[PDB]
Swiss-Prot record:
Location within or outside the cell: Membrane; Synapse, Synaptosome
Covered residues, full protein: 170 to 208 of 323
Residues annotated as transmembrane: 13-33
Function: Regulates the trafficking and gating properties of AMPA-selective glutamate receptors (AMPARs). Promotes their targeting to the cell membrane and synapses and modulates their gating properties by slowing their rates of activation, deactivation and desensitization. Does not show subunit-specific AMPA receptor regulation and regulates all AMPAR subunits. Thought to stabilize the calcium channel in an inactivated (closed) state.
Quaternary context: The L-type calcium channel is composed of five subunits: alpha-1, alpha-2/delta, beta and gamma. Interacts with the PDZ domains of DLG4/PSD-95 and DLG1/SAP97. May interact with GOPC. Acts as an auxiliary subunit for AMPA-selective glutamate receptors (AMPARs). Found in a complex with GRIA1, GRIA2, GRIA3, GRIA4, CNIH2, CNIH3, CACNG3, CACNG4, CACNG5, CACNG7 and CACNG8. Interacts with GRIA1 and GRIA2. Interacts with MPP2.
Name of protein: Voltage-dependent calcium channel gamma-2 subunit
Protein's organism: Homo sapiens (Human)
Tissue: Brain.
Family from the record: Belongs to the PMP-22/EMP/MP20 family. CACNG subfamily.
Disease as annotated in the protein's UniProt record: Intellectual developmental disorder, autosomal dominant 10: A disorder characterized by significantly below average general intellectual functioning associated with impairments in adaptive behavior and manifested during the developmental period.
Domain of life: Eukaryota
Lineage summary: Eukaryota, Metazoa, Chordata, Craniata, Vertebrata
Length: 40
């Protein structure tokens, strides 16, 4: 106990990549629904 292990560097690049990938995936659906609403 009291080892003070650190989650450190580029592990956070995975956590950042999650947010970036999810912000990608939501915008795709905006493009879908807007692109389909154009042909309505």
């Amino acid at each position: 106990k009291k080892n003070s292990y650190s989650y450190g560097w580029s592990f956070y690049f995975g956590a950042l990549s999650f947010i970036i990938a999810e912000m990608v995936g939501v915008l795709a659906v905006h493009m879908f629904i807007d692109r389909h609403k154009q042909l309505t």
